[PDB]
Each structure stands twice: as C-alpha cells, then as structure tokens.
Amino acid sequence: PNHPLWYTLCDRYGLYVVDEANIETHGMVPMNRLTDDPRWLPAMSERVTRMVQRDRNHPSVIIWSLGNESGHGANHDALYRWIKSVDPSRPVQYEGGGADTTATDIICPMYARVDEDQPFPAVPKWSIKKWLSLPGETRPLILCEYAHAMGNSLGGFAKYWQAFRQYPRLQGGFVWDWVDQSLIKYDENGNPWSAYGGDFGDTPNDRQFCM
Amino acid sequence: PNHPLWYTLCDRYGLYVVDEANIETHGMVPMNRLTDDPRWLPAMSERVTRMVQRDRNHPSVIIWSLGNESGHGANHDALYRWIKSVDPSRPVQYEGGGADTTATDIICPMYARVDEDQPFPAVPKWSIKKWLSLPGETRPLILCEYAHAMGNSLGGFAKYWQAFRQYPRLQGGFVWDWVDQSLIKYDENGNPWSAYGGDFGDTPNDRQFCM
Ligand code: NA
Ligand code: NA
Ligand code: NA
Ligand code: NA
C-alpha cells in the first residue's frame, strides 16, 4: 500500500488503482512455503485486512491484490474470500501460483507473451491469446507485469496492443515499470551520479536489475 | 446423406463421418426465408428425421449436421432439439446464421481465418483464435469448410495446423474439398477432355468454381 496521499491524487486526477497488500515471499523455496503455512496466516491477514480497512472508500482503487510473488497457498484462498465477503464492490487479483488460481478473479500473468507459449512445469505462461480459451476458462486477462523496460527495451510493445484491441477479454496490463531505481552518489568533486546495485559495497547483489 | 455403402466402408476402414441432412437453400433472399417459415418445417423435418433413422447405428457417424447454407431459422432450432432428444450419443452441428447459433454444439465456421477477423454484419467470421474466447463462449471450434483447394491453392495451410496444435479447443476442420467436379466431354475427333460449368450450354453458370 502507498502513501495515503497517492490515492487522493488518483481520485482527483483520475487513475485506476490496484491496491496491493504488503506481502512478498519471493525468496522462499518453494515460493509458497510461508503462504501455505497456517502459522503465517495471522501476519498475512493483517497485511490484507488493514489495507482494505484503510483504503476501501477510495474510488480510484478498483481492484485489490493479495500481494506479489509468494506462490499460492491456502492463506491466499482464505484472504481472497475474506475480501470478497467484506467488500463485494471490487474484484480481487493475485498472480502467484500460475496467475489463474482460485485466489484470483482476473488472469494476471507476468511476462506472458502474445503468441508464444512458455510451458514451465506447474506454472506455465501460456500465450495470452491461448490462455483465454483454455477449456473451462472464463476470466478476463490483464497482465500484472509485462514489457520489461530494462535499459534499451520495449521491443514488440506494439504486438501486445494489437492483441489488446482485437480480443475483448484481453483488457491490457501494467508495464514493468515506471521509474529507474537508481540512487544518487558523489565522487571526490561533488558531482552527482546514478548508483545501482553493488555501488554501496552491497553483496550479494543483482546489479542494474533495479532499473 | 451418402450412398449407404459409404458408412459401412468408413466403419471398417476407420474414418469419422459428419452425416448431413439434404437441406441447402443458399439462393433464397435472405438465406433463411424457407428455414424460418413454419410451412417448410414438415419438408425439412423429413430430411433430418429420415437420415437419423437410417444412419444412427453406424459407429463412423460421430456428428449430425442440419444441412448447409440455409441461414438460421426457427425450423433449425426445432430440428436441433429433435436430434438431441432422439439420439444423445452424437453432437449436432450447423453452420448457417453465423456458425455459432443456438442450433449448433460446435462452432463450425466456413473460411474463418487464423488471425484475421472478417467482421461481416450479422454473420461475422472472427479469427478462429479470437472466436474461442468471445465473452461467454465455451464450445469447441471445428471448421466445416476451410482452405479452399481451388486450382493452385492451399497457401497458408500450415498456419491453420500450427493453431490447431496450439489451442486445445481448435480441434481442426474439413478442407473444401476432395474432388474436382469436372465432367468428361467429347469433340469431333473423340477426344476425352475435362469440362467445367458452361461447357454443356448451361446458362447461367459459375464456370471453374465447381473444381
Ligand atoms: Na480487449
Ligand atoms: Na527489477
Ligand atoms: Na487443438
Ligand atoms: Na465450388
């Protein structure tokens, strides 16, 4: 969840907001180790419930998210249902566990391609066009992250938009992402320069992957 | 309906048969002028009922068809339901009226393309990949006619097969069609040559379109 003023400004200027619980357990092995453990349900529930209690009156918020990259565990199912019960006015989405689990109203993959399947075991990233018509699938598809804009990038962006416009149930997505996460450092003169991962003696690091 | 020996041979050799009623009213304006007229129901019913009564024991017949290019009329709905009631063992398909009407268990367009929509009013031919995922649509898609093999043709045939293999619910199609409808004619010498439309004094005609 963002700074409270962010919602107010989105209300007044006009932007659709996905308000997202502060839950990411990307580093766990497997990714759902904590989110499937009932002993972590209380901690997780507070991050969902106190978000809804704070933000539910903002018109700009149109979708709740259960967090990010925490696999899919039973705690997600529990908290999905809690929101649907407490606030029927907004869809709930969550990408973990394959983007189309029982804890999401919206098929919301990250980095699924327009035409090409990426059939990883357990968590495949189908072509977005194919995903829509998998037997029994009815949900709309909106990418929670796509067109990774790292450095000299956004190649093939037009291909997404052509498909967004042709397929009613492909309703767009969220580019990853808005702003380079570079920090300002100084040399011996007093000249500012853009510092990324590794430039503060930090180790292990993932380097320029913040930008 | 075919010569009775056809079904026997398809039973023994192993081919899947779509058995189709002898109903085509293509030249009406509009196409359903007869099939929506309750006075033509008796005549239509006998073409459907008598086919089912003849052929229902043949294992090779796996799908019933209500005919071809006769628009979509209320008589089609009546007869669709008569088959479903009399023989639950086989799906019913019918292409008229836009290939996805209430009178078909299978989306069965003729000459719908792989990626390109052809948005004709009332009876659009959506791209087959798009058709699958239209809001609310659940049925499988099998083209009753595709890849027009007229003379030097079948360009793009591979594009169809790639999509059939990638999309579970795209379950193939029927090429149009098997055999050139040329006839053997003779001249002053006694030369056997191949004759198409018009070569018999017949007027009006549509020429090489029979091949
Ligand atoms: Na769309
Ligand atoms: Na990053
Ligand atoms: Na298929
Ligand atoms: Na023809």
The experimental method is X-ray
B18 and B65 in contact (C-beta within 8 Å)? yes
**CATH T-level fold of A1-211:** TIM Barrel (3.20.20)
Taking the Cβ of residue A117 and every Cβ of chain B, the question of whether any pair is shorter than 8 Å is answered with yes
Q: What's the distance, Cα to Cα, between the start and end of chain A in Å? A: 21
| Number of alpha carbons in the 13 Å side-chain half-sphere of residue B69 | 8
B104 and B95 in contact (C-beta within 8 Å)? yes
| Cα gap A139→A91, rounded to integer Å | 11
Which stretches within chain B are classed as H helix?
5-13, 41-55, 74-86, 128-132, 157-166
For residue B119, count CB atoms less than 10 angstroms from its CB and return exposed for 0-12, middle for 13-18, buried for 19 or more.
exposed
- Give catalytic residue positions of A: 69, 145
Sign of CA dihedral B41, B46, B49, B55: negative
Closest approach of B143 to chain A, Cα-based (Å): 17
B90 and B80 in contact (C-beta within 8 Å)? no
B145 a catalytic residue: yes
A120 CA distance to ligand 3 middle (Å): 19
SS3 state at A64: strand
Between B41-55 and B74-86, two packed helices, what is the crossing angle to 10 degrees?
30
| Cα gap A132→A138, rounded to integer Å | 7
Q: How many CB atoms lie within 10 A of CB B115?
A: 15
Sign of CA dihedral A23, A27, A30, A33: negative
Q: If you ran DSSP here, which 8-state letter would residue B45 be given?
A: H
Q: What are phi and psi of A11, to 5 degrees?
A: -60, -45
B69 a catalytic residue: yes
Taking the Cβ of residue A169 and every Cβ of chain B, the question of whether any pair is shorter than 8 Å is answered with yes
| Cα gap A208→B90, rounded to integer Å | 60
| Cα gap A47→A56, rounded to integer Å | 14
State which amino acid sits at residue A53: Q
Instruction: Please state whether the peptide bond connecting residue A87 to the residue before it is cis, i.e. omega within 30 degrees of 0.
Output: no
| Number of alpha carbons in the 13 Å side-chain half-sphere of residue B72 | 16
Structure token pair of residue B145: 């006619």
Closest approach of B103 to chain A, Cα-based (Å): 21
- Check CB contact under 8 Å for B169 and A132: no
What is the domain partition of chain A in residue ranges?
1-211
| Cα gap A59→B51, rounded to integer Å | 61
Which segments of A are annotated as binding site?
24, 26, 69, 145-148, 205, 209
C-alpha distances (whole Å) from A122 to each of A30, A52, A71, A106, A138 are 12, 31, 11, 19, 20
Which residues of chain B make contact with A124, given a CB cutoff of 8 A?
none
